[PDB]
Design a protein around this ligand. Structure first.
Ligand SMILES: CC(C)Cc1cc(-n2c3c(c4c2CC(C)(C)CC4=O)CCN(C)C3)cc2c1C(=O)NCC2
Length: 209
């Protein structure tokens, strides 16, 4: 069973702005997704200090960057807290509403797309480079889920039939035809060094065979 949901009006408006605005500094999507993963790692690490059993699903706290030229995909894997079904459908979207409204007002007031993170809606910068985004996630208190959106005002949520993850999130970016530079090893290295050099977790860039 695949459930289809409409995005909150403000979120749909933000996604349209990200996809339709002429903005060359697209590389910022990577630091935004790395920031989301770093926050998820911080959350599980903190919670594990009071309840160590929260790490039974995996002790390693890291981020993996996996480019795939054949599939034209860039995958960001983290062993963070993961997201529940309620987080994917309601919680994060509700939280993002105020930030989205504030960001769009700031953009009208003279701010630029790179400031997206200051409003806590950085996840949506994935649409600067991806035509479709697939989010595979597993939280300790829930089943493994697959969230997906090609924008256009809707998203889908289904129980993931694929390989079990243990705990964490996989963000699969199905890249736009003219955005293949983000699959090159030296380009990814340059972006990580420039914007995410002080992330407190190991960032491993997987090289293609
Ligand atoms: C910020 C952490 C705790 C959770 C998280 C949240 C999100 N995220 C966020 C937002 C959204 C998402 C992912 C989606 C698919 C639920 C969409 C969304 O609105 C809005 C607010 N941001 C602060 C975070 C994305 C990821 C993750 C994650 O665990 N790993 C990398 C991908």
């Amino acid at each position: 069973e695949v459930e289809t949901f409409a995005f909150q009006a403000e979120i749909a408006q933000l996604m349209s702005l990200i996809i339709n605005t002429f903005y060359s500094n697209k590389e910022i999507f990577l630091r935004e997704l790395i920031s989301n993963s770093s926050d998820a790692l911080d959350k599980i690490r903190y919670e594990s200090l009071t309840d160590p059993s929260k790490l039974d699903s995996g002790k390693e706290l890291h981020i993996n960057l996996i480019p795939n030229k054949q599939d034209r995909t860039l995958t960001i894997v983290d062993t963070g807290i993961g997201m529940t079904k309620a987080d994917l459908i309601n919680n994060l979207g509700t939280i993002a509403k105020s930030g989205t409204k504030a960001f769009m007002e700031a953009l009208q007031a003279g701010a630029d797309i790179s400031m997206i993170g200051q409003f806590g809606v950085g996840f949506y910068s994935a649409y600067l480079v991806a035509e479709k985004v697939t989010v595979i996630t597993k939280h300790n208190d829930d089943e493994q889920y697959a969230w997906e959106s090609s924008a256009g005002g809707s998203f889908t949520v289904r129980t993931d039939t694929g390989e079990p993850m243990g705990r964490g999130t996989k963000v699969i970016l199905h890249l736009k035809e003219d955005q293949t530079e983000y699959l090159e090893e030296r380009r990814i290295k340059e972006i990580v060094k420039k914007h995410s050099q002080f992330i407190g977790y190991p960032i491993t860039l997987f090289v293609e065979k």
